[PDB]
Amino acid sequence: QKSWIESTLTKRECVYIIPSSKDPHRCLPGCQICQQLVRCFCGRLVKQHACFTASLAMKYSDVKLGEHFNQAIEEWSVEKHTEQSPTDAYGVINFQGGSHSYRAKYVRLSYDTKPEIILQLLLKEWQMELPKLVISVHGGMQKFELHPRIKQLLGKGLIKAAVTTGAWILTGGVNTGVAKHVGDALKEHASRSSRKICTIGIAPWGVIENRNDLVGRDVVAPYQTLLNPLSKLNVLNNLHSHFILVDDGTVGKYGAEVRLRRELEKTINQQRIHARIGQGVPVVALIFEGGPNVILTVLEYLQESPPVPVVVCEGTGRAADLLAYIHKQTEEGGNLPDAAEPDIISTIKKTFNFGQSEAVHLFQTMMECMKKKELITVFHIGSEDHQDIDVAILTALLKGTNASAFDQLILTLAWDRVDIAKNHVFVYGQQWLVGSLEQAMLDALVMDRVSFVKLLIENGVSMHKFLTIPRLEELYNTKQGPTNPMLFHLIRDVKQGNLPPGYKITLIDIGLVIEYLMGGTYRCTYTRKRFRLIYNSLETKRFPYPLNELLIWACLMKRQVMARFLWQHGEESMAKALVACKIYRSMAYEAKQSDLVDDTSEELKQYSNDFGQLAVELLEQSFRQDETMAMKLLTYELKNWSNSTCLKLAVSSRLRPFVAHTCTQMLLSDMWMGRLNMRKNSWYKVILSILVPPAILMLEYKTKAEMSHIPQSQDAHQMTMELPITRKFYAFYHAPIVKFWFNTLAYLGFLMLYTFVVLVKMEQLPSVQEWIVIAYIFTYAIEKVREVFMSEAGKISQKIKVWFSDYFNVSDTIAIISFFVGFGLRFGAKWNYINAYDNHVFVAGRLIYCLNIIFWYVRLLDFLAVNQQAGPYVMMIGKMVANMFYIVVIMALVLLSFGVPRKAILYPHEEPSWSLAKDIVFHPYWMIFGEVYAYEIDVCANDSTLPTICGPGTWLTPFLQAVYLFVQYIIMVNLLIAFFNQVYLQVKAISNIVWKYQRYHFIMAYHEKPVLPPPLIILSHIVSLFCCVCKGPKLFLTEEDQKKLHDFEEQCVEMYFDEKDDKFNSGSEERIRVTFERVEQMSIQIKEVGDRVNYIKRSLQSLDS
Amino acid sequence: LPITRKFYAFYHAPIVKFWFNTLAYLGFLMLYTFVVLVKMEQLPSVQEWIVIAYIFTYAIEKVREVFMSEAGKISQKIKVWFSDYFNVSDTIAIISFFVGFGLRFGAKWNYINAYDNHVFVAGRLIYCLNIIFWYVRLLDFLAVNQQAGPYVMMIGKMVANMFYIVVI
Amino acid sequence: VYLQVKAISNIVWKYQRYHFIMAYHEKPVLPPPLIILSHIVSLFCCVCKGPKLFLTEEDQKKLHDFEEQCVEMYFDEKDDKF
Amino acid sequence: NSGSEERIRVTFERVEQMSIQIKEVGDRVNYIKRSLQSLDS
């Protein structure tokens, strides 16, 4: 039946008839009134049962004999006469009301339903997730009433306490009592608002009026919400979400749940509270207006299986408030003022008519309650003690169970209540044995609760002695808490795509993940030789810089709020932020690449750009203090980060606001010059000094002091250590600015010669010009091979895919390959000697050169793209050409729309021919450029140049061409121009940042090239080869300076953090909504005082009364 | 996932029916371009028959998607379909083709010169103008792409609303 | 015109995908020269003798549950921001 | 002097002396009422 409720759980049927209150009366013949009102000790009529076996008494007489000795009549028991016979009330209520529906669920069941299946109904069947708190509400069972202040404050606190701990409120489920007032408070407070306070009412079935409506299988239970006061029995309060209804087998009887309700709570405080945490779910109990049984059940908690605290509030009603009285006037041991029982027994007889000897018993038991007042909690709502019932509720479960302060934190940690922990658990004079703090931190980190981590870090914890290898290895490999599906995929690939089905994660295999995420030739400290051994082998396992290893964790597991927090702590702030940007950015790519079950990449994209801006804002700060030191920060080896550099890391992430920041730019300019002081020299003096070397010794060079911030080579460092002449030439020819204008001049002289060769005739053998051309291209090629093999990546297949990912490197490959095809044909041809251009192998060779040369003119746009003013226009041209594809397809369609009808009308006797392919494109294309072929349009006109193709239909071709040019020349060309106009505006908006970012790869290229240009470069290769066969820039800082840099780090690391808060406090509209927050305490307190001012003035005249 | 079910999954996907009609339509224009550019003898060539077959069945295809439309009133199945630019153009392109075929085919061939019989010429010249309809129908295939379609929308709005500048 | 269309071009393209895609959900699987066989077979079928989301009741039920849950969460939200 | 948002942040400056002094008076109003019953004690 797929209805586990129907199957395992069951109802109760009165299957026997025992006349109750059988008092024969009106309407003289017996049977009629013996058939009118003969109730049973079950509670129903014999005619209201009928029950397929109780109908057998409607017809004859009550299911028994006649008189049927009254020694035997009394003997009902649901144990004896009641058959179970599955439930018929497992529907769902649709409580009608406000602009919503207050939907809720229910079930019928017996008072002896097992405590485990009722759990297997709440959690398994109803999907309801196990709580971290229960609020067992035990107050008034009649329609009690309260005043406005308590109506709001008590409401918020009870609600909020359930919000924080995801609690399960428990009531009777009946809107005569607590449930009415419990449920109400949820209504106004908007607890529903993107939120649920799980709320349950254990009621009995028989009473709830319109129970017969709820009868039936799974249905939208049309509970009618009639507030008709004729139905005393009850109206189910329409806010409680769930209604377990004890079908004990009685109707009109009461108290079917009193044990079950408790047993459910007993087997709610008997399961774990999030397995990382080991504790039973704590259970508070509250008291509203309340009766003499409501105080009685307080004695069923204080002296009960694991002691259940009590949160009697102050000011509610008769019970909840009176228990404050006996609390207040009586000592910690419940020591009464001896005239208490001589004047409280008036209070009982004042509040109740419970009696006198009865009342004596009440206070006596009520002190038997108050024998232990370390465990109850009077919420003094007047005088504002705990300032919401909440803080008293939660505190009440952290005091009176002889629990340890670790056992007190660990619960607060589970609840998301730091405020409870900092204010109560972290109280003056506390014990905290040895690793309690440490065990909480392994719990707080895996559970992703920064606010407790933050607190613990302030309250004695140190990450230095707490990051051991088993521990942090644990902290990686936990699916408890916010879990990443991506890391398990990342470990898959690096582990050959082979998982042991269990596969505990090591620190080692993670190191290969980072080396894949950071890319290039990064080497994590988890894959090194020393670490890899001591790991297997395993005091020394305390990780010299732990806050570096946790920042990796928080980012590999998408725990941003932990990452961003931990980043604040420790040192190497700017570096950690540029790694994080790289880690997230790569995972944000591998999501979009792997494209599996995984998702959530734009979330990672945002996380990278979050840390990216942090590194930029630290650069700003550090640069506004000392420009020179900031440059040194961009270039010191890190040594915890694979001996990399903060700049190098930011280029890997393509983090442009950092590379386009004026600090890097001023440094990029200083590496461009080398030891040349170009603020004093000029680029025309560099060109002159290349062509006239003696001017090299006339230029203004630099010292060591104004070169100390610049990353230098081993040589450029050393040659300055030990300003003579030979060192003045070494400074010039090794500067990147010189290697540019020395390759540029050779390249321009290359094109001048190569232009001369294609324009001047070729005899059999090459001329000196053509040999010098071939020499350039040959060595230029070797130069390009080297800068692939000597790239930065390590995998040759990735050294390759990056280099071929640039336009001008692809073009050079084609230009170099196409040249030697041409040389091979030009040179390997058998010369004719009657005419050069009769041998078609020689011609093909020459014609490849004359097209080859176009590649080499266009390579000059790459030299021009170096200039700040020209480069934006080279970017445009590429974006224009790349993205105009679809306009040009339309243009080619419009073209054939015209070219095919024209050729068909004008040339109607054409066999198939290759000319037909030319003649449908040729003239229509030159029209695009405004050539209308004026004397060819009308071919039958007297001034025609085509008088012979006059014939039938040819008069159609002017009309065709008139339409064509309007569409082509006016619409389509200016649509393309309109596109290009928007490209222009887009590029100019971004052109300067992109130019600044591309200076890096540019300048670093001309820091690695040889000092000789491509014809003479071969000597530099030779010398730089037989060196290696026989046998880059680093900021060299002495320890005295290396020290002060770290001092300049921390000082600027510091001043940044302080600043952000200070500006952020001020705000603009923040301040206005901080005002509005303050508009309440005024209005409340202008009503506080304004409430008393009427209380003041009544006094004054009463004192003069 | 057996074999016959793997073919049923492919040829019944909309992406396949697009790139299968698109390739036939492009092969249609390649042939129909070949027919107008190459001379016509008395009877059609295999190329021209394959052209006529396309256009004939292409028409029946358009009849069906009117009668098998979503509306119920035939007079509203009609006014909606003719409310699209390329369905109006196809109607003209289909009607104008068979006027041309009827003249091209129903003409009395001359045998001294094809282009002396003016009924044959009118037929050929309708085809050579008819073909413009079929190049322009390709803008509807291109309008499927996110990048090209905005430029087809422009051209229509440009042409529709430039009336008064062109009168001046 | 250019600037006007580009401001609205992406919404209109997205709206026109519907009639486009639904067209090529109803067409025959054979293209217009060979389509005649598809007409013939799809005619003598009718002479002799569209897309629906088929949900089993177990799933059809949970959809209505996904309705109301999201129907609910919407109404609560609007007020709270407002 | 007049300003536009200046005035709003001159208000916010004044939101404190009110809140302090609404707590000044509001501190005493509890000190007042305890008196009255203590004078009638």
Ligand SMILES: CCCCCCCC/C=C/CCCCCCCC(=O)O[C@@H](COC(=O)CCCCCCCCCCCCCCC)COP(=O)([O-])OCC[N+](C)(C)C
């Ligand atoms: C990752 C790297 C990035 C950078 C890219 C770098 C890679 C660049 C890659 C470049 C590849 C270039 C390929 C050239 C192929 C030539 C084909 C050809 O047409 O041959 C012709 C000559 O063939 C001969 O062998 C005779 C000519 C002398 C050799 C000159 C070509 C080799 C130079 C190579 C220098 C390599 C340069 C690179 C050096 C490093 C064949 O025709 P024929 O014999 O004339 O015809 C005879 C007919 N007849 C008898 C009727 C007359």
Ligand SMILES: CCCCCCCC/C=C/CCCCCCCC(=O)O[C@@H](COC(=O)CCCCCCCCCCCCCCC)COP(=O)([O-])OCC[N+](C)(C)C
């Ligand atoms: C605005 C200025 C225009 C005035 C407006 C009024 C329209 C005036 C039009 C009037 C139509 C009558 C003129 C043609 C009569 C035959 C004469 C002739 O020699 O024709 C020649 C061609 O042309 C033709 O054979 C037909 C041309 C029709 C074009 C008109 C289209 C509608 C114009 C808009 C309608 C207007 C209203 C709507 C506007 C919104 C014959 O051939 P051929 O080219 O010499 O050469 C071929 C070979 N041959 C030499 C061996 C023969």
Ligand SMILES: CCCCCCCC/C=C/CCCCCCCC(=O)O[C@@H](COC(=O)CCCCCCCCCCCCCCC)COP(=O)([O-])OCC[N+](C)(C)C
């Ligand atoms: C809601 C719908 C949306 C979709 C739109 C769909 C609707 C599309 C509607 C299309 C309507 C097309 C109308 C064609 C009229 C031809 C007129 C003509 O010029 O005839 C000529 C031939 O006439 C003949 O009868 C002989 C040629 C054979 C018949 C070919 C045309 C019929 C094909 C129809 C296929 C219909 C296709 C549609 C099928 C579904 C008359 O001239 P002649 O005899 O050559 O001259 C003799 C002179 N001489 C003796 C001196 C030489």
Ligand SMILES: CCCCCCCC/C=C\CCCCCCCC(=O)O[C@@H](COC(=O)CCCCCCCCCCCCCCC)COP(=O)([O-])OCC[N+](C)(C)C
């Ligand atoms: C690779 C590009 C780099 C930039 C440009 C480099 C070169 C710039 C330098 C000069 C450009 C011009 C070259 C000389 C042309 C000589 C002309 C000739 O054929 O014979 C002549 C003399 O010839 C000699 O005296 C032979 C010279 C030996 C080779 C010199 C190589 C030096 C450059 C090695 C490279 C390293 C240096 C650069 C390092 C940065 C006589 O003249 P002609 O014949 O009556 O006149 C020619 C006209 N004709 C064709 C119609 C007949």
Ligand SMILES: CCCCCCCC/C=C\CCCCCCCC(=O)O[C@@H](COC(=O)CCCCCCCCCCCCCCC)COP(=O)([O-])OCC[N+](C)(C)C
């Ligand atoms: C002797 C003379 C005889 C020989 C003459 C030979 C003729 C000359 C032949 C060719 C021109 C010479 C240069 C090659 C073209 C540039 C490649 C390119 O775009 O690279 C770039 C992208 O790369 C890609 O996107 C890869 C796929 C290519 C894209 C499609 C266009 C090019 C294909 C061929 C179409 C034309 C057919 C030509 C091919 C047969 C890498 O550069 P980037 O800086 O990263 O910018 C890219 C940015 N983007 C990816 C976002 C867009």
Ligand SMILES: CCCCCCCC/C=C\CCCCCCCC(=O)O[C@@H](COC(=O)CCCCCCCCCCCCCCC)COP(=O)([O-])OCC[N+](C)(C)C
């Ligand atoms: C990637 C590498 C690609 C290319 C590799 C190498 C390919 C090797 C290619 C060619 C080598 C073949 C040598 C000759 C073969 C026999 C023919 C012969 O000798 O003569 C014939 C030559 O006929 C021709 O067509 C010559 C031109 C062919 C080359 C076309 C360009 C290819 C490169 C494209 C650029 C690629 C750029 C790619 C860049 C990435 C005729 O000449 P004849 O004998 O004087 O005439 C006799 C007849 N007569 C009596 C009427 C006069």
Ligand SMILES: CCCCCCCC/C=C\CCCCCCCC(=O)O[C@@H](COC(=O)CCCCCCCCCCCCCCC)COP(=O)([O-])OCC[N+](C)(C)C
């Ligand atoms: C034989 C004729 C050859 C000359 C051509 C004459 C025509 C006019 C030519 C060129 C004007 C540009 C030259 C002066 C630029 C100096 C400043 C500059 O822009 O610096 C840039 C570098 O320099 C470049 O990027 C310039 C590129 C040089 C190659 C030119 C090839 C194209 C011209 C070939 C002819 C093709 C057209 C057809 C005409 C025949 C920026 O670098 P930087 O490190 O920032 O610079 C210093 C630091 N600072 C600027 C920050 C302070």
Ligand SMILES: CCCCCCCC/C=C\CCCCCCCC(=O)O[C@@H](COC(=O)CCCCCCCCCCCCCCC)COP(=O)([O-])OCC[N+](C)(C)C
């Ligand atoms: C002899 C004849 C005369 C010679 C002409 C003169 C030589 C030609 C002149 C200029 C050549 C192009 C300059 C490149 C500038 C750099 C661009 C670049 O780096 O990336 C661009 C791609 O790059 C491309 O798309 C390359 C262009 C394709 C090949 C050019 C064909 C030219 C003819 C075709 C026209 C004919 C069609 C109709 C003809 C019937 C970037 O594009 P993006 O993706 O939008 O941006 C990403 C940014 N990124 C750079 C960071 C990656």
Ligand SMILES: CCCCCCCC/C=C\CCCCCCCC(=O)O[C@@H](COC(=O)CCCCCCCCCCCCCCC)COP(=O)([O-])OCC[N+](C)(C)C
């Ligand atoms: C409807 C459009 C759809 C797309 C394209 C479809 C067709 C693409 C297929 C091919 C394109 C070319 C067509 C054949 C041309 C033959 C040439 C000829 O006249 O005789 C020849 C052989 O001819 C035969 O053997 C007759 C073939 C019978 C008809 C075949 C129909 C198949 C397509 C049915 C449709 C369903 C398939 C597609 C389903 C998606 C010999 O050649 P020739 O005569 O020496 O040279 C001709 C040039 N001339 C005129 C100058 C002489």
Ligand SMILES: CCCCCCCC/C=C\CCCCCCCC(=O)O[C@@H](COC(=O)CCCCCCCCCCCCCCC)COP(=O)([O-])OCC[N+](C)(C)C
């Ligand atoms: C073999 C060759 C020989 C024969 C050659 C024959 C020549 C070729 C003849 C014509 C071109 C072929 C296609 C027809 C034109 C498109 C119609 C149209 O605009 O439809 C659209 C509107 O429809 C209307 O608005 C209805 C009234 C027409 C508006 C005025 C312009 C067209 C009139 C005729 C003027 C030209 C005179 C030509 C007519 C005699 C429906 O499409 P839509 O997607 O809803 O877009 C509309 C949006 N709008 C309404 C807001 C704007």
Ligand SMILES: CCCCCCCC/C=C\CCCCCCCC(=O)O[C@@H](COC(=O)CCCCCCCCCCCCCCC)COP(=O)([O-])OCC[N+](C)(C)C
């Ligand atoms: C909606 C339906 C519209 C059309 C329906 C069908 C209309 C039926 C139309 C024509 C059928 C008429 C058949 C021939 C009649 C007698 C004349 C004759 O035989 O020869 C004459 C033909 O003279 C011409 O002008 C022929 C061309 C007329 C058609 C013009 C296009 C109409 C369609 C527009 C497109 C519509 C697109 C609309 C799409 C929505 C002369 O030729 P000859 O005999 O060789 O010469 C003898 C003289 N000689 C000795 C000097 C050589």
Ligand SMILES: CCCCCCCC/C=C\CCCCCCCC(=O)O[C@@H](COC(=O)CCCCCCCCCCCCCCC)COP(=O)([O-])OCC[N+](C)(C)C
């Ligand atoms: C052989 C000759 C060469 C062939 C040329 C190439 C073929 C021709 C090329 C392009 C053709 C048009 C592309 C249509 C694109 C779709 C547009 C569309 O759907 O609706 C548009 C209407 O549509 C029109 O107005 C249609 C254009 C009128 C007919 C074209 C005449 C061309 C010549 C005239 C010039 C000559 C004048 C002067 C001459 C002396 C929408 O317009 P809207 O109301 O603003 O927008 C509503 C939006 N809606 C779509 C949702 C409804």
